[PDB]
Design a protein around this ligand. Structure first.
Ligand SMILES: *[C@@H]1O[C@H](CO)[C@@H](O)[C@H](O)[C@H]1NC(C)=O
Lengths: 492, 71, 71, 50, 50, 99, 71
């Protein structure tokens, strides 16, 4: 399973009476779905990219100065015209030096002087911004069932089907081998906010750098560097990298501000990275809402039997997942294939099996089977696999795991979670009331401030909270109550 | 040349990201740079607490502000 | 990773220097960063003045400080 | 004329022979021969082993 | 039956190959090849060069 | 924790706690790791006089560890099995097939 | 059976004792051992100051005890 290759793993159970479930497929999580009477599925978003989209303003971080000429004149001898002023990608600045007779004048005073350069750029020193067109954007969702085989990260899984979701193809069916079909409907428009996202790009051929980044729109449109387009020859505002010193009556010296790469890299603290696999410009973080239909699925191994009790041996040690499940792998060298007798009693009653399974109906195939995963209540637990058993203590608490689900219910509610309340499925007065409370909330609160940052958020929140104490009208003292929201909410 | 940081956006992130562990702690090293290297002026800040108008709420709202003024 | 500026140093000078008309004005252009990008916050600091404070002398000490604190 | 030069500094870094080793939690945490060599930058961390 | 081990701790240390180097105050402070060899403990300090 | 078991007049294994174990400021390493991590603890320095600072060898720690220390338990080794001497385990005992 | 340390004879100081002032700050770095490793207790020693004592001058000796006393 791919969900056992990473940290962020969120279980979403499937009740009987509700078989079409809406998810949120973030990028960097893996949602395991366990439907009763249906094969449990692992669903995750794989990649978000676009095959060579449009690009915006580029920025040159290292100005290539060339053809540096200075015109100077005696104070009343005609402020000198220069032909170099009238091309683009040229920077000029008028100034009043003090001509002497050390440079062969007739009078003294404010000698007029002007210098000019041709502000070119250095090779592969462009800060290329990109934008998204949803015509070529692809959301890739790979789904892997629990076939009983475990597959590594460097390996590939044979039954791992892959669904691409453009905005044009928003309804996709995937035959999951013998398990059946899964119906997937992902709305690309109701996902990553593509409008306020700039993909920045430096030299991708430099080895030890992130290839692309994922920065803000109005942040990017107000940088203070030289800026050209795709295929532009002239520059605009190139006097930002070019700073003129004070002259000494003949040569006003011109100074480059060198490379500004690390300057920009200090401005990317808290950015999500973005991979570039040549053509594609991948994102590494995002979100989308999909719908998972499991009515066209069914189990595998219902016309088989329960296995032997004896021929199970531990290939693999039952250990905790870090997400309160116990994984294993058996070596069954007998009557294949068959339903593995997986059962796990508790402490206090050895009668009742309490093995909340994650791989339902495990079968040791003629070339497959073995991987079993189960969730258990706290306490001592004897996980039987036939005659073969295993002493286990579930280390999580009873209220601790429910509180862990609340912890996920807190830390999921960052800016990803501001759009994402589809962790449930058609709640009516539960889910849609969450949208009713939070869509206007996050919709207005991100609109205000323009995005301002943790320091000014935890400054201005405390500022308005201090202004709450100095309040004229107690009926209008709910501005303090507004200020209280402006401290605690935006600390994620 | 000016660039403000991407502290304004801080848009998403559940994959790989930059130095957010030491992004807010840039300033927490700067202000401690104002403390450990200007110890005389750091002890000059005590002369506002227990000598000037020490109104309870407006002590810290002057102190931490004045310490974080110096870039 | 941070190099501090020569806001601190400022030794001497009758020769030539880098940016003497911009060292003081880097921060002023940054204030324009917290105004032009944040015109809604330019309106949000008005309600600080006439609806909350009623403390005419200390109003400037609120406004200017809350702008300069924004880095 | 040619005064005594103090601390040099490096502004642009040259990075090569990138060597990474990882271990399990309780199977002897990761070491390298280049951890202790000169001109080498290392950082010990903990992964999430599946 | 022989569990895994954790950190081992040397009780009685052993020193050898001790190399000492100093420099004048403004004549390029001291270095050694054993400053960045494995299992080598060093300390920079200010002497009083007469 | 295990010191030299070949020393005749000592216990063989011991039993101590992990938190204090990571609070040990002795130089450490792992299985197969050649050099000692935080080796500046059994090695200290002094003050020179313009030429030679003598890096002093600092010696042994068999006493500070085990001999001036207030209320810690022990264990045992017999060959290739690291025994214990303290312990507890919950067992259910069904006498139903006895007579 | 322990051997006490010889901190009750200090004889001279012109040659070379083992450790200079750092050995005098053993019980001033172990106190930071009390601070950084017992943040629960480090915050628990604040409720003694401003809720139970009300004895501003004599609070210093109370802050020394229960931190520097125990090993
Ligand atoms: C995957 O990595 C493991 C770890 O060393 C290795 O044993 C295995 O052969 C690798 N498989 C592939 C296909 O790279």
């Amino acid at each position: 399973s791919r969900c056992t290759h990473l940290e962020n793993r969120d279980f979403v159970t499937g009740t009987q009476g509700t078989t079409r479930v809406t998810l949120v497929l973030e990028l960097g999580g893996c949602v395991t779905i366990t439907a009763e009477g249906k094969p449990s599925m692992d669903v995750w978003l794989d990649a978000i990219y676009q095959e060579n989209p449009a690009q915006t303003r580029e920025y040159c971080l290292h100005a290539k100065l060339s053809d540096t000429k200075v015109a100077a004149r005696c104070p009343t001898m005609g402020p000198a015209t220069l032909a170099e002023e009238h091309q683009g990608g040229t920077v000029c600045k008028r100034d009043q030096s003090d001509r002497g007779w050390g440079n062969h004048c007739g009078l003294f005073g404010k000698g007029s002087i002007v210098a000019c350069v041709k502000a070119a750029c250095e090779a592969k020193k462009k800060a290329t911004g990109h934008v998204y067109d949803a015509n070529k954007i692809v959301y890739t969702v790979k789904v892997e069932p629990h076939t009983g085989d475990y597959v590594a990260a460097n390996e590939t899984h044979s039954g791992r089907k892959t669904a691409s979701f453009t905005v044009s193809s928003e309804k996709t069916i995937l035959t999951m081998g013998e398990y059946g079909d899964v119906s997937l409907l992902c709305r690309v428009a109701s996902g990553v906010d593509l409008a306020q996202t700039v993909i920045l790009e430096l030299d991708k051929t430099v080895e030890h750098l992130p290839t692309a980044w994922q920065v803000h729109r109005d942040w990017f449109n107000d940088l203070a560097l030289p800026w050209k387009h795709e295929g532009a020859r002239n520059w605009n505002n190139a006097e930002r990298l070019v700073e003129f010193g004070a002259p000494h009556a003949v040569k006003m010296d011109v100074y480059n501000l060198g490379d500004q790469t690390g300057v920009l890299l200090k401005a990317l603290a808290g950015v999500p990275v973005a991979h570039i696999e040549g053509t594609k410009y991948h994102l590494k973080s995002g979100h989308v809402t999909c719908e998972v239909g499991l009515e066209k699925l069914k189990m595998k191994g219902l016309t088989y039997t329960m296995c032997d009790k004896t021929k199970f041996t531990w290939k693999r040690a039952p250990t905790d997942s870090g997400h309160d499940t116990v994984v294993m792998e058996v070596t069954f060298s007998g009557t294949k294939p068959c339903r593995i007798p997986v059962r796990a009693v508790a402490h206090g009653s050895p009668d009742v099996n309490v093995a909340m399974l994650i791989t339902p109906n495990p079968t040791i195939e003629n070339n497959g089977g073995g991987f079993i995963e189960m969730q258990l209540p706290p306490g001592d637990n004897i996980i039987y696999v036939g005659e073969l058993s295993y002493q286990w203590f579930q280390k999580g608490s009873s209220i601790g795991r429910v509180f862990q689900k609340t912890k996920k219910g807190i830390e999921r509610l960052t800016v990803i979670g501001e759009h994402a309340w589809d962790f449930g499925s058609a709640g009516g007065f539960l889910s849609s009331i969450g949208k009713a409370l939070h869509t206007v909330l996050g919709g207005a609160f991100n609109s205000i401030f323009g995005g301002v940052g943790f320091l000014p958020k935890l400054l201005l929140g405390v500022a308005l909270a201090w202004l709450g104490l100095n309040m004229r009208n107690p009926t209008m003292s709910m501005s303090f109550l507004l200020a209280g929201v402006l401290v605690l909410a935006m600390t994620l | 040349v000016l660039i403000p940081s991407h502290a304004q956006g801080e848009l998403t992130g559940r994959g790989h990201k930059w130095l957010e562990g030491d992004s807010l702690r840039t300033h927490l090293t700067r202000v401690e740079g104002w403390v450990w290297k200007n110890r005389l002026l750091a002890l000059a800040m005590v002369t506002v607490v227990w000598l000037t108008l020490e109104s309870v709420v407006t002590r810290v709202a002057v102190l931490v502000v004045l310490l974080c003024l110096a870039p």
